[PDB]
């Protein structure tokens, strides 16, 4: 929490800053947004002025959350056709290279199969949470209701008290309110046990993406750590490279530990 | 007359969570539908009671006073 | 091919069934398309069945000739 604890803006220094200096940042981040045009803009601002009062912020929660999971297909596309381009290039070279850039593309390609399956829970939870604000709209006529039929009786026993519909209304307010008294329990009995259950489901799905990538990347090093390199003077030739069943091998226990891990066999533990 | 439109609202009530039903039994709109209905006959389990409470205490007074 | 109509007609059966219960339930059509379903899924209980039956024998029978 740098912005917090402090009025900068900048990053305070930590272990991984004190081990290695952060790199600059990024050259590419142009100060237009561009995202996306005005379509992100109109249905962030459309979905807030419609509906009822009571459930407007969870209508521009649950669009937010749609344009979150939109982007990371996109991402995760992108990423698949970069891991294409990079084994398609790699063929034009040298025999151990033409090997490890074709099982390198082949790794990386898992990363858009696991965000397919993120992007599937992350649509779950936010259709869980679109439950909740479809309850909540639906909950709150009665209480306007209730104001309304008050403010009535209200005025009318200013204007006169010998009007006759005093009692009519005193009695519609009385079941109003009787109506009212079960309706906020029934509002209030849900949300905590919904949220509750929404947030856990999205917690264990990053955390089992995030665990099932850094197993991957791993391999990937393991792997990558097998690509022998030397200089080579001018007029020499290279030994003839003769690694292929080691990769094969590499591949298929990555393979085998991606499917055989489950969520309770998790590495990591929090403390 | 003020009574009526508390048991008109439940009645479509009703009929509209009978016709979501067939219509397709995996909408999201059954729990909250189901709820209102409740609520709806909680209502007007007092409603009718309070409805019936002074129809037979006015009746007899306005009749005992025409009499007389 | 031939086995598909069955199950057709139990999906069309309990369609109507389905429609005409929430049309009135006062019809007294009810008891005898609830017959009548009945009937349908004790017939296409066997018909499911010797379907299944002969599917894993005849391709089974089929490869290995072709393979050999
Ligand atoms: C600077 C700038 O104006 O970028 C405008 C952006 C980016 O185009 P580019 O990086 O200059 O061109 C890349 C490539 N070499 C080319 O010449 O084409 O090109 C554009 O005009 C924006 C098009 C969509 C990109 C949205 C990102 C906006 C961030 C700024
Ligand atoms: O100043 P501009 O007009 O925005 O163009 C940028 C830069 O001047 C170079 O043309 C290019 O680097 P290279 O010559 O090395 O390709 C860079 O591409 P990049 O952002 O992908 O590095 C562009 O973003």
């Known amino acids: ?7 900068r803006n900048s990053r305070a220094p930590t272990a991984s800053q004190l081990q290695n200096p952060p790199p600059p940042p990024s050259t590419t981040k142009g100060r237009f947004f561009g995202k996306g045009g005005l379509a992100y803009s109109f249905r962030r601002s459309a979905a807030g002025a419609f509906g009822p009062e009571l459930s ?35 063929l034009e070279n040298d025999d151990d290279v033409s090997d490890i850039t074709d099982k390198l593309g082949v790794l990386i390609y898992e990363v858009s199969e696991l965000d397919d399956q993120f992007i599937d829970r992350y649509d779950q939870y936010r259709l ?3 439950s909740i604000r479809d309850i909540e709209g639906s909950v709150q006529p009665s209480r ?16 006169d008290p010998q009007s006759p519909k005093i009692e009519v209304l005193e009695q519609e307010l009385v079941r109003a309110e009787a109506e009212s ?33 850094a197993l991957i990347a791993g391999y990937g090093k393991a792997l990558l750590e097998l690509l022998d390199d030397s200089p080579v003077t001018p007029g020499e030739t290279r030994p003839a490279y003769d690694g292929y069943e080691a990769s094969k091998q590499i591949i298929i226990d990555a393979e ?16």
Request: without cysteine.
């Open 181 to 213: 008294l079960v309706a906020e329990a029934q509002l209030s009995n849900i949300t905590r046990s919904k949220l509750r259950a929404a947030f856990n489901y999205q917690f264990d799905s990053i955390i089992e993406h995030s665990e099932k990538i």
């Open 144 to 159: 306007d209701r209730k104001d309304k039929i008050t403010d009535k009786i209200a005025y009318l026993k200013y204007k």
């Open 1 to 7: 929490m740098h912005r917090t604890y402090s009025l």
């Open 56 to 90: 407007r912020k969870l209508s521009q929660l649950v669009k937010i959350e749609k344009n979150v999971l939109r982007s990371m297909e996109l991402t995760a596309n992108e990423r698949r056709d970069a891991a294409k381009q990079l084994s398609i290039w790699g």
């Open 256 to 271: 085998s530990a991606l499917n055989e891990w489950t969520l309770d066999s998790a590495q990591v533990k929090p403390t």
């Open 128 to 130: 869980t949470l679109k």
